[PDB]
Nucleic acid binder design. Structure first.
Ligand SMILES: [Mg+2]
Ligand SMILES: [Mg+2]
Ligand SMILES: [Mg+2]
Ligand SMILES: [Mg+2]
Ligand SMILES: [Mg+2]
Ligand SMILES: [Mg+2]
Ligand SMILES: [Mg+2]
Ligand SMILES: [Mg+2]
Ligand SMILES: [Mg+2]
Ligand SMILES: [Zn+2]
Lengths: 134, 136, 94, 125, 38
RNA sequence: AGCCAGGAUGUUGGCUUAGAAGCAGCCAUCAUUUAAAGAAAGCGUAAUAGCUCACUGGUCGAGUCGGCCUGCGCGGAAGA
């Protein structure tokens, strides 16, 4: 029962993926290319989280979830890297429509009651990496 | 290390330390280190201490030093008989009577200040306590 | 509101005062106004815990002396040099 | 911690949703993750259900606010109450399937109409 | 066994004791915190 | 105080790094479901995982916490 964050159409380098979930009994290339077959639709350069579920027989089922609050906030403000000094140094900007798009993606991925709760959790990740909401 | 820029006379009578202190109260900072016991503070002591509580506050808030080492102490060196004058001036001291306020402080959290003052007092010869400025 | 109970001082001087302070009581005074001064004694503890609030110094309090209140303010107070103690209090008639 | 004022206000909020609620279900909350509990909180805000875990001797003071007083012996043991403010049922049908899904805790005693329902007969709701 | 005239709690698991008229500091966690007065 | 239970999502917050995922280091430290759950008080990893803590519900059943001021004692305390 492991989790990783893997770039869009990508898999099978040695340090990020193979050892981590490969010491758990998982076949590495089925995860790799069924995850690049599922996440071929995610834009190039966004890490997308993947939850791997392993069973006593090593046959696994993974739910690929929507890209992180921090990655959809990197892309919706246009930027590459967020702030090394958040809310002191501010690195980009998103109007409330992008807070709400990222929070519809994460409306599929949150615990929130309303799209205002998911927009407010994406508001929180918007204040975390320094980005301004405008 | 504190010491009078220039003096009227070079040497002094040993004098006594008697009676109680003036400046019993904290007139600048919110907190102060008061002396309970009676003794002489060399400049070295005061300096080391001021250092201690300067490390302790990470150079924040503010620190006053209310005491000054203005009276010169002498010593004849080893292997020297009595007489032949008064000894040479070794170092400077401040006479301390019970209830003087050695350092004042403010712009800081109280807890932190009690701490810094414990660390400051580790370097001092005499019995000391923590105190707060009051209204009247 | 602060109410301080007190007795009239039958004695005076350094000796009286230091016997007062030994007994866990302390001397204070009430002056100001048309009247004559009134020297009184108090319980060190009650007052020490009472001036442990700030308003004590900014406010009109009352002092119960032989059935009779007076309304006063805190004028100045001399404290023992290193001890959590009170040597004396100047009360000015309010 | 909680001041007496804190406890007083909270007793007023439980008594206030208790007056407004159509039906309630008391259950054991022990031995279940906050993941499945936020799952029954989503399945709660979706069913109109008001979910709570409240102190016992607090809930004797709030349930003294009537007509749930038949539940004051159901408060021995950890208490998780589901008030359905919208619809009756949808708490009692959701809890049996959540406790059979988890196979943890209990779901002990319900209350409707002013009477308590024993554990195997909560299938009435 | 740090043997000294000032003995203290060096963490939250250190527990002070007086055994046979000696003040010691005993730790479950850290053998290095074992102290006696002297 | 003990003992049962949980200590959640966004999320591996961004920075940085071959790796930093609460726990090298730099900066922010928000919001959600909340009974409660620090962008985490320590052990832990190549980095994770793994282990307690803060915090809260349960059982328990009446006093408990730590400063202040003093009285008398303990350690500090070895020599022909
Ligand atoms: Mg003289
Ligand atoms: Mg003078
Ligand atoms: Mg006379
Ligand atoms: Mg005399
Ligand atoms: Mg023995
Ligand atoms: Mg307890
Ligand atoms: Mg008490
Ligand atoms: Mg001895
Ligand atoms: Mg010996
Ligand atoms: Zn220890």
């Amino acid at each position: 029962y492991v989790k990783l964050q893997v770039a869009a159409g990508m898999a099978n380098p040695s340090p990020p993926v193979g050892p981590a979930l490969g010491q758990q009994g998982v076949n590495i290339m089925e995860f790799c290319k069924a995850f690049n077959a599922k996440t071929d639709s995610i834009e190039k350069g966004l890490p997308i989280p993947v939850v791997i579920t392993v069973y006593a027989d090593r046959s696994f089922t993974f739910v690929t979830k929507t890209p992180p609050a921090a990655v959809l906030l990197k892309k919706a403000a246009g930027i590459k890297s967020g702030s090394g000094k958040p809310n002191k140094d501010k690195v980009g900007k998103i109007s409330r429509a992008q807070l709400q798009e990222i929070a519809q993606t994460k409306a599929a991925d949150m615990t929130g009651a309303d799209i205002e709760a998911m927009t407010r959790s994406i508001e929180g990740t918007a204040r975390s990496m320094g980005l301004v909401v405008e | 290390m504190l010491q009078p820029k220039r003096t009227k006379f070079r040497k002094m009578h040993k004098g006594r330390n008697r009676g109680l202190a003036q400046g019993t109260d904290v007139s600048f900072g919110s907190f102060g280190l008061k002396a309970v016991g009676r003794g002489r503070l060399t400049a070295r002591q005061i300096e080391a201490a001021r250092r201690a509580m300067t490390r302790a506050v990470k150079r924040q808030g503010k620190i006053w030093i209310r005491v000054f080492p203005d009276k010169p102490i002498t010593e004849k060196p080893l292997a020297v008989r009595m007489g032949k004058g008064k000894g040479n001036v070794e170092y400077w001291v401040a006479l301390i009577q019970p209830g003087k306020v050695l350092y004042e402080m403010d712009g800081v959290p109280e807890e932190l200040a009690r701490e810094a003052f414990k660390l400051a007092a580790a370097k001092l010869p005499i019995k000391t306590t923590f105190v707060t400025k009051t209204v009247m | 509101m602060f109410t301080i109970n007190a007795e009239v001082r039958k004695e005076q001087g350094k000796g009286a005062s230091r016997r007062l302070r030994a007994a866990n009581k302390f001397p204070a005074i009430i002056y100001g106004g048309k009247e004559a001064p009134l020297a009184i004694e108090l319980d060190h503890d009650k007052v020490m815990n009472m001036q442990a609030k700030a308003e004590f110094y900014s406010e009109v309090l009352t002092i119960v002396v032989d059935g009779k209140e007076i309304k006063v303010k805190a004028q100045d107070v001399q404290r023992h040099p290193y001890k959590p103690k009170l040597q004396h209090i100047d009360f000015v008639r309010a | 911690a909680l001041n007496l004022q804190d406890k007083q206000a909270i007793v007023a909020e439980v008594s206030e949703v208790a007056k407004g609620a159509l039906s309630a279900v008391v259950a054991d909350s022990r031995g279940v993750t906050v993941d499945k509990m936020t799952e029954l909180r989503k399945a709660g805000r979706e069913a109109g259900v008001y979910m709570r875990v409240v102190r016992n001797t607090l809930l004797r003071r709030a349930v003294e606010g009537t007509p749930f007083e038949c539940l004051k012996d159901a408060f021995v043991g950890p208490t998780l109450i589901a008030y359905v403010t919208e619809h009756p049922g949808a708490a009692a049908r959701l809890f049996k399937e959540f406790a059979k899904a988890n196979a943890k805790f209990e779901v002990k005693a319900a209350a409707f109409e002013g009477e308590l329902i024993p554990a195997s007969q909560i299938d009435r709701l | 066994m740090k043997v000294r005239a000032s003995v203290k709690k060096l963490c939250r698991n250190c527990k002070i004791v007086k055994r046979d008229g000696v003040i010691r500091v005993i730790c479950s966690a850290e053998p290095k915190h074992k102290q006696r007065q002297g």
